[PDB]
Amino acid sequence: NMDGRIVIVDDEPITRLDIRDIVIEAGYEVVGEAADGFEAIEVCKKTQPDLVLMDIQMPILDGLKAGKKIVQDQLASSIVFLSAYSDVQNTDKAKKLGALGYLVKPLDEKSLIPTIEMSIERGKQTQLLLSQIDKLSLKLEERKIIEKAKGILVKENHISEEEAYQMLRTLSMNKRARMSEIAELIVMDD
Amino acid sequence: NMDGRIVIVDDEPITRLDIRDIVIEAGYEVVGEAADGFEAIEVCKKTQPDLVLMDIQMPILDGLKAGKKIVQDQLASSIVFLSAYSDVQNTDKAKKLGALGYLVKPLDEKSLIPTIEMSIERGKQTQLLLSQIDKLSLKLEERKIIEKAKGILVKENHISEEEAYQMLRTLSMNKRARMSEIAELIVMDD
Ligand SMILES: [Mg+2]
Ligand SMILES: [Mg+2]
Ligand code: NA
Ligand code: NA
Ligand code: NA
Ligand code: NA
Ligand code: NA
Ligand code: NA
Ligand code: NA
Ligand code: NA
Ligand code: NA
Ligand code: NA
Ligand code: NA
């Protein structure tokens, strides 16, 4: 039926069991549970879920701080908040840390399953886009630093740009360091 | 008092009015309204809203097709669906086309304002990511096509890489063309 790996985070045990029953009847896999933010971070690090269902308010460590950590280290693909609190200050924190949904307790159960589906898909889309950005940024910066190092090597040695690139390559091969690290060493403080 | 520009799309005038009253009381600007998918596409193209609230079940053209069009041509920053139906086929289509929220009628009003805040924030974030990807890709492709053109000129002319680049520069400036446009002509599926 519905596919996804879910972690449930709430300090009230019966509320966790009610949510658990709902998502298991939908066919999601509940890969872990937690009662405070420290447990939430721990469980998400181990399980690496598609989604965290979390109350913003919990003992010891609140859900917003736990969520900030979970997004920051990408321990789950998406976070959806479930809380009795819905003031603008709490929702501004939840949206700025990165949450994909926020339903207010008592839960409208019919909305929960659609919200989970949307949040899982959007979270994995976002992870893909951030990976694209990382790769593209790396390739562009490596081209830039290699170009700058080539210019420096030409000016210092009086070689051609082709010979400078072959210097960077042969150094990279023989050392077993990337040409961008070689180039950074050539460029430093210039 | 919230901030955001919203289009409300529902075939029922009373439901449009109920939602309008809620979001206006919250402080959002309703920039347009529609009763079918063709109207919704047109309104979004004129208004370019931060969010469109859309029913799936509509005559003439349904919400999923209109939403797919709105995402494809970036006519709104986010879509949230509002349907009496919550089945897996409708939710699969909504998530794949790229919706950020799906909520199920009759509306749990207390969730609506939080879901709007999340969806607007996530939509603006995603547009930033997509913009960064396009900028990085264009810069990288310009570098790549110039590199390819330089190597072609070197091999045909038997000039140095430096002289090849100055050829591309001189052509670009004399023709008042982008150097990538010149390089595209030099490469011409070589
Ligand atoms: Mg609590
Ligand atoms: Mg309808
Ligand atoms: Na289970
Ligand atoms: Na993750
Ligand atoms: Na904040
Ligand atoms: Na997304
Ligand atoms: Na990421
Ligand atoms: Na150079
Ligand atoms: Na409704
Ligand atoms: Na953002
Ligand atoms: Na592009
Ligand atoms: Na050059
Ligand atoms: Na340009």
Residue numbers in the entry:
A (entry chain B), B (entry chain A): 0 to 189
What does the study report here?
Within the crystal, EutV showed a symmetric dimer ‘dumbbell’ conformation with 48 residues contributing to 1870 A2 of buried surface area and extensive hydrophobic and ionic interactions between residues Ser85 and Glu161 of each chain. The REC domain of each chain dimerized through a common ‘α4-β5-α5’ mode forming one end of the dumbbell with the ANTAR domains forming the other end. The handle of the dumbbell consists of a coiled-coil that includes residues Leu128, Ile132, Leu135 and Leu139 and forms the majority of hydrophobic interactions within a heptad repeat. The interaction between the two ANTAR domains is stabilized by mutual hydrogen bonds between Arg142 to Glu146 (2.9 and 3.0 Å), and the amine group of chain a Glu161 to Glu160 chain b (3.1 Å). The dimeric state within the crystal structure was unexpected given the recombinant EutV used for crystallography was not phosphorylated nor supplemented with phosphomimetics. SEC-MALS analysis performed in this work indicated EutV was largely monomeric in solution although may form higher order species, likely a dimer at increased concentrations. In this way, during crystallization and with an increased concentration of EutV, the dimeric state was likely preferentially favoured. The dimeric RNA-free structure of EutV resembles the crystal structure of the ANTAR domain protein AmiR from P. aeruginosa. Within the EutV structure, the conserved active site residues in the N-terminal REC domain are in a ‘phospho-activated’ state, as indicated by their position relative to the to the BeF3– activated CheY/CheZ complex and the BeF3– activated EutV bound RNA structure. This positioning indicates that the dimeric structure of EutV observed in the crystal is representative of the biologically active phosphorylated dimer required for efficient antitermination.
